[PDB]
From Swiss-Prot, chain A:
This is Histone H4. The modification N6-(beta-hydroxybutyryl)lysine is found at K7, K53, K67. The modification N6-(2-hydroxyisobutyryl)lysine is found at K7, K20, K35, K53, K55, K67. Changing Y74H: In TEBIVANED3; results in early developmental defects when expressed in zebrafish embryos. Acetylated as part of spermatogenesis progression prior to histone-to-protamine exchange. It comes from Homo sapiens (Human). The chain holds residues 26 to 102 of 103 of the full protein. There is a cross-link at K7, K35, K55, K67 (Glycyl lysine isopeptide (Lys-Gly) (interchain with G-Cter in SUMO2)). The modification Phosphothreonine is found at T56. The modification N6-succinyllysine is found at K7, K53, K55, K67. It is linked to Tessadori-Bicknell-Van Haaften neurodevelopmental syndrome 1: An autosomal dominant disorder with onset in infancy, characterized by poor overall growth, microcephaly, hypotonia, profound global developmental delay, impaired intellectual development, poor or absent speech, and characteristic dysmorphic facial features, including hypertelorism and abnormal nose. Other variable neurologic and systemic features may also occur. Tessadori-Bicknell-Van Haaften neurodevelopmental syndrome 2: An autosomal dominant disorder characterized by poor overall growth, microcephaly, hypotonia, profound global developmental delay, impaired intellectual development, absent speech, and characteristic dysmorphic facial features, including hypertelorism, abnormal nose, and wide mouth. The modification N6-butyryllysine is found at K7, K20, K53, K55, K67. Changing P8A: In TEBIVANED1. There is a cross-link at K67 (Glycyl lysine isopeptide (Lys-Gly) (interchain with G-Cter in ubiquitin)).
Swiss-Prot record, chain B:
The modification N6,N6-dimethyllysine is found at K25. The modification N6-lactoyllysine is found at K11, K53, K76, K84, K88. Belongs to the histone H2B family. The gene is H2BC11. The chain holds residues 34 to 124 of 126 of the full protein. The keyword Protease does not apply. The modification N6-succinyllysine is found at K2, K84, K88. There is a cross-link at K2, K88 (Glycyl lysine isopeptide (Lys-Gly) (interchain with G-Cter in ubiquitin)). Its main location: nucleus. The modification N6-methylated lysine is found at K84. The modification N6-glutaryllysine is found at K2, K11, K14, K76, K84, K88. It comes from Homo sapiens. This is Histone H2B type 1-J.
From Swiss-Prot, chain D:
The keyword Acetylation applies. One of its GO terms (molecular function) is DNA binding. The modification N6-crotonyllysine is found at K22, K104. The nucleosome is a histone octamer containing two molecules each of H2A, H2B, H3 and H4 assembled in one H3-H4 heterotetramer and two H2A-H2B heterodimers. The octamer wraps approximately 147 bp of DNA. Core component of nucleosome. Nucleosomes wrap and compact DNA into chromatin, limiting DNA accessibility to the cellular machineries which require DNA as a template. Histones thereby play a central role in transcription regulation, DNA repair, DNA replication and chromosomal stability. DNA accessibility is regulated via a complex set of post-translational modifications of histones, also called histone code, and nucleosome remodeling. The modification N5-methylglutamine is found at Q90. The modification N6-(2-hydroxyisobutyryl)lysine is found at K22, K60, K61, K81, K104. GO terms for biological process: chromatin organization; heterochromatin formation; negative regulation of cell population proliferation; protein localization to CENP-A containing chromatin. This is Histone H2A type 1-B/E. It is found in: Nucleus; Chromosome. The keyword Protein transport does not apply. The modification N6-succinyllysine is found at K81.
From Swiss-Prot, chains E, F:
This is DNA repair protein RAD51 homolog 1. ATP binds at G89, E90, F91, R92, T93, G94, K95, T96. Belongs to the RecA family. RAD51 subfamily. The nuclear localization may reside in the C-terminus (between 259 and 339 AA). It holds the Pfam family HHH_5. The modification Phosphotyrosine is found at Y34. It comes from Homo sapiens (Human).
Amino acid sequence: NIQGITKPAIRRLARRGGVKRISGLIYEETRGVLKVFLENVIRDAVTYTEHAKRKTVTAMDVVYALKRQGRTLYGFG
Amino acid sequence: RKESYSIYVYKVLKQVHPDTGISSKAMGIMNSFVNDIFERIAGEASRLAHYNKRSTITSREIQTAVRLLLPGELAKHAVSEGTKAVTKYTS
Amino acid sequence: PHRYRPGTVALREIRRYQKSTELLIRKLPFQRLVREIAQDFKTDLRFQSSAVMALQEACEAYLVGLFEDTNLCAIHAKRVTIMPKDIQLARRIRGE
Amino acid sequence: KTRSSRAGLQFPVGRVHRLLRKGNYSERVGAGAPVYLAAVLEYLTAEILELAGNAARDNKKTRIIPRHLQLAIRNDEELNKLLGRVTIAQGGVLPNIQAVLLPK
Amino acid sequence: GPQPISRLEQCGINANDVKKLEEAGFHTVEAVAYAPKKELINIKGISEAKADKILAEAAKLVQITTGSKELDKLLQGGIETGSITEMFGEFRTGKTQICHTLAVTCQLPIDRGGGEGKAMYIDTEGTFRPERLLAVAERYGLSGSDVLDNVAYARAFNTDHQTQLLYQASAMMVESRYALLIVDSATALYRTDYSGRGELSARQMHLARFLRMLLRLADEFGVAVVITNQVVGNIIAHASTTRLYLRKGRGETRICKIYDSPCLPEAEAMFAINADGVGDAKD
Amino acid sequence: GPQPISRLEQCGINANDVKKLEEAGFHTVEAVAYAPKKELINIKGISEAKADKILAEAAKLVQITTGSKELDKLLQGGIETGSITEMFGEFRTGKTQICHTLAVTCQLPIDRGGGEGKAMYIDTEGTFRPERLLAVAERYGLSGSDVLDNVAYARAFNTDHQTQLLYQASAMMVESRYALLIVDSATALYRTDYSGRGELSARQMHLARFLRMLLRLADEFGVAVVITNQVVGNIIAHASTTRLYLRKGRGETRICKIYDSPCLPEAEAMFAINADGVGDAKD
Amino acid sequence: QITTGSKELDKLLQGGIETGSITEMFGEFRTGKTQICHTLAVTCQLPIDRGGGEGKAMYIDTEGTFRPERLLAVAERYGLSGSDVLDNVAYARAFNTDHQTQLLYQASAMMVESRYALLIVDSATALYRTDYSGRGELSARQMHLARFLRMLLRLADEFGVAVVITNQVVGNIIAHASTTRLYLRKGRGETRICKIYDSPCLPEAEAMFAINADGVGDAKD
């Protein structure tokens, strides 16, 4: 499913990041990086979900995970 | 029920820009903001009180916490507003 | 027939996407990825819609910032092309 | 009569006081503490809304959106410092291209 | 007199801090001296320690005829030098015209009701007319060129510039004897610059400092302080010694009223605005 | 005099911005000059930079008998040229009739109490009658055709058109000598156009600019400014030099009262409205 | 001047309504506005030497109060053919404010074909309150009324006919706009008190009159 994060999408992300030229090897690298990030956040989010004895991950679960990883997110409280 | 700072944010907005509104997403971000800064200041004040073996959080702890958390001019103006507000309130 | 020189359209895209705020990854594959990853931590999970949107906003913000630092690393090495080693340097210095 | 009115504030002194009492911060809370805190929060809110309103007006919009908040915050050195590790959803980024990437 | 801030540098304030004070607009030891610590601290690149060193070392170092006879009688002979006199009235009542006239009458001999001093016109509204000064000078038999030579002119573009010109006025007013300082639409820039509502306290602080400088210059140089106010303030009342209400009579002839003066009665006197001059009413 | 906005184009304002100013209704450098930045910015296709360039380059470039003897005596001989005189009274008191009469009496010789100038009738209420002007002209022995020739006429359809005609009046009043500018039901369009309550500040701003233009034209051309007000305003009081209260006496004879004048006493004078004229009361 | 046929009102009006102008009568309910309209609808047809305008009448009704029998009674009072009065009165009920304005276009084209002296709009302001009853829709009724009034004045000046509009006192533009203002208040029974509260030709003054089966006619205690 990670391959669903397509090359043109990664290119758009890089453009917003100010990147003008992009090596062909970036895309796979980016995917690995993305996966790691997602994994970490989601691992924490679900932990919160499990503590609340729920089967549904809430926006707040995610927000708390992000906060405790020093990546505070505004807008989903 | 489910609390937020929305009405107070809107009152302030009306104070600074009478003819300006705000989107739902933007209001959500403002609420996130207020809760965030609340937590930062209250938490630092809590630690200040603990370090000094005090059981009470007073305006002095709030002020010191503000001095620790806010940069430069923001810190000075915030301290000024808090002090002014407490002085107006006391009488 | 007209053809823009290499770089002109890239710059145009930079201005375009730095001007806007819309999410840059497609909704459905991201959601699919999120559910897949989540499954290896806990069984039988469901997701609030806004939870998946929260994860996407966070992920895209993270990647854009990382690409900013990566770009700085590429330019540091007198290049204009970002490479995996740029990403790896950025992530090492970030403490990742 | 409300405490906010006596303090010259828009932000809720009573609510802030209750949130302090119930937030497990300390066993006791002084009467001036929620006034001070509410005043600080209101000040910061006012500063951000002031700048964001400006950005909204430049964009000829009557409503402030997340983009205007991001523009207001990142273009202000001290606000940007205060919110250095914060992500504003749907905020995007500041327009910024490294000079070396430009033609000529 | 003045104590130019240069002398503060020999006390051991570093020169960069003196440059920061001049950038802020403080050009004399007098300027740093009569201010609390916070004024210097708010300046970029100035800490509380440098402000304490500055204040300590600074403490170590530190009737003009209106030319309308009826107005002179209303004022008992003319403006008292050394004090601020406020004339509040509707627009076009002649505040600017009176200022232009006084800019010349101040230069009149004291025996003619003048102060025998030069004039200062700080404009905020564009209404400064050297030709009006020339007309008043030839009216009273004063050199119109010397009036412009006895008027140092600069248009204040904002409240900060309005206050900053007084610092230049303060240093400049020492080199030549002056009798009149003119600030035209003095309150207009505090409404146009500070147009928001949350910034009202800021304009009040800036205006307060501006008024203190005006009073300081009046007591230092024995000059008349004239400010014009558009009423689309009571703060000036305690600062202003004589409040004159001006209203228009049709043609070029103006009605003057006293609406507050702790010493002068509330009373009225009629005068006119003539091409040459601000001059007695001739119905 | 005027400074047509054409000259602004040689300062290096682009011609499209001058066309935008004329579309807005600014046709002289005088028009752009005495306005703040925001007026030009609100115009479509004008940025703050262009407005600053316009203001900077613009700053580089920049008793009439009423024919009623009793009213003339009440006014001490007639309207003072160069000032705005407001007559507020009930409907049908003769404001429009007085305007029609003055549109001709202004053309009377100064020795007859006139201004020896042409008249301007800007109508907002449909009450403009060339035949009334002809009757007044033949009454005072003035050419009725020349009165219509000394009256440039246009009906203002709205407040914006009411103010825009003054710009045409300002440019047109330069080509011929005028003595009278008439705005009939001047306040009616600010109530009919701006009929909502949230738009009151908008009509007040537009009216303020309109009044400033009226005063400007009076001081520029030495013409009388006459506005008629329906009372189904105190803002005009500071702008108007003489306030006259008009009430009807039965038949065609009208009672005039002064209800405010800083110079004229509150007093009354009786006059009539005759087919030929606005003319002295003959009980 | 179209004679009201009441001498007290005629003297009050100095002989009657000016043709070519709009006449508004604002007064309380039951003061006789409609009765005066019905009377004038016939008196307009009277000879000018009798105080008439020697023209046909137009009754535009908005309130249902149109009575051909009242026209017949007024006609026999003044010795006019009641049938010819109904034949010299073209009648149409304005169903709404828009229809009220729409009837003027047919009235404008029709008033050219026959000589008229009187145009009647009964409860002219009622439809702007009944149709436009909301508060956000006030500007709509005011802007429709303004256009309607301009059409009325144009037709009055065009055909030299009298324009009569009735106002219930439970637009402010109309006060100066109406050429003859009669303030109506009830005297008990069928006798009405009239006051002039504005008139371009007439004094502010009062006259007493009655509403009689034959006529709108002077009060005779």
